[PDB]
Amino acid sequence: GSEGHRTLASTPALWASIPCPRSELRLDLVLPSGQSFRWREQSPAHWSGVLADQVWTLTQTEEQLHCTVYRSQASRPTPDELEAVRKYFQLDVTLAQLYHHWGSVDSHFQQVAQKFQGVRLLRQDPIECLFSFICSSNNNIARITGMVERLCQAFGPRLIQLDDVTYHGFPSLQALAGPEVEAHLRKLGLGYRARCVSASARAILEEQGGLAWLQQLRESSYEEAHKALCILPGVGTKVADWICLMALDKPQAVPVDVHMWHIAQRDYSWHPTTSQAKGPSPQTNKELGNFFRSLWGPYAGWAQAVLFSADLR
DNA sequence: CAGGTCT
DNA sequence: ACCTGG
Ligand SMILES: *CCOCCOCCS*
Ligand SMILES: [Mg+2]
Ligand SMILES: [Mg+2]
Ligand SMILES: [Mg+2]
Ligand SMILES: [Mg+2]
């Protein structure tokens, strides 16, 4: 009872609810969908992971988001701790309002979105997000999850153990910048991406001003933050857009990939007009992202998340 | 060859 | 131009 991953039924005294409709947040569409790679459904409908340097288990009913924290004497999450969950899910951003806007300007969105409510963006840490998305180059969601887990196990601080899972926090820049990290990361199957992690951890810390430079790209404009991220090894345009959208408070960023081409073409009959080339290219990908920004508005990347979730079936 | 990044 | 999965 007192050992292991908790469930709402098994230890009801250690949970606290946050008012949050299922239409504002679907955990099963947000937490496993390749935004974060570090949440696990360890019991049915119960998602466990590291959030604000502690381990949480989250589950929901129709009107409540139920939360528990593993810290020495076990107790409910305090008020300040629940705000970190609200902050992580960005719950002040009302989806009801966004879905209404997107629907009003896009009848295709109106048609598809009703089935896929509660899709929102997590407000991720920029370090974690950066190095996760560096591991996603030439890769799929299954292997990426594994690489990130091993990376965190090897180089991240031990938090606590629940059942047979030892939770680790995401590694610091210092740990990823350290001697022989590439070789160690290669032993963990990351391949050529091992170099990129090491090099980008070193470039941030030793060439760019460290953690502070990255964190202050939150305050900088989208265009600035994107340009700044591209100088890092393993970070091209797509990767930078993902980081901008997921970790640097740029809701207008629209990461363009072949998947977005398929949507644009099949669902909006989109073709590049200004650009010369017909297919994907840096010129045409920039044009596509702009199309959806003008269509959807300042939260275009959140809209994309909904269509991405809907296409996934 | 597909679909990203580096210079 | 360069890289690695399917
Ligand atoms: C698509 C070319 O990949 C860029 C990675 O370069 C090797 C350093 S990790
Ligand atoms: Mg991430
Ligand atoms: Mg290193
Ligand atoms: Mg780069
Ligand atoms: Mg908008």
Numbering used by the authors: 9 to 79, 83 to 324
Lines quoted from the article behind this entry:
Most forms of damage to the heterocyclic nucleobases of DNA are repaired by mechanistically related pathways collectively referred to as the base-excision repair (BER) mechanism. Both the recognition of damaged sites and initiation of repair by BER are performed by DNA glycosylases, lesion-specific enzymes that recognize specific nucleobase damages in the genome and catalyze their excision through cleavage of the glycosidic bond. Among them, 8-oxoguanine (oxoG, OG) presents the greatest challenge to the DNA glycosylases responsible for its repair, due to its unique combination of structural innocuousness, extrordinary mutagenicity, and chronic low-level production. The question addressed here is whether the 8-oxoguanine DNA glycosylase responsible for oxoG recognition and repair in humans, namely hOGG1, interrogates DNA in the same way as the functionally equivalent bacterial enzyme MutM, despite the lack of an overall structural and sequence similarity between these two oxoG repair enzymes. In summary, we present X-ray crystallographic structures of human DNA glycosylase hOGG1 interrogating DNA lesions in their intrahelical position, achieved by covalent trapping of an ordinarily transient state in DNA recognition.
On the basis of this screen, we have selected the Y207C variant, because it crosslinks efficiently but is substantially distant from the active site of the enzyme to participate in the catalysis and does not interact with DNA in native LRC, and crosslinked it through the X8 linker to the minor groove N2-exocyclic amine of 3′ guanine of the target nucleobase. With this and Y207C variant tethered to X8 linker, the sequence-matched structure of hOGG1 encountering an intrahelical oxoG•C lesion, referred to as the EC, was obtained and refined to 2.38 Å resolution. In both IC and EC structures, the target G•C and oxoG•C base-pairs are unambiguously intrahelical, with a root-mean-square deviation (RMSD) of 0.244 Å between the two structures, in which the RMSD superposition was performed for all atoms. Similarly, N149 rests on the minor-groove face of the target G•C (in IC)/oxoG•C base-pair (in EC) and hydrogen bonds with both bases. The only notable difference is in the longer distance between C8 and C5′ of oxoG compared to the corresponding distance of IC (5.4 Å in EC vs 4.4 Å in IC). In the EC structure of hOGG1, the longer distance and the bridging water molecule between C8=0 of oxoG and the C5′ and 5′-backbone phosphate, respectively, could help bend the DNA at the target site, bringing these repulsive functional groups (i.e., oxoG and backbone phosphate) close to each other, thereby initiating base extrusion.
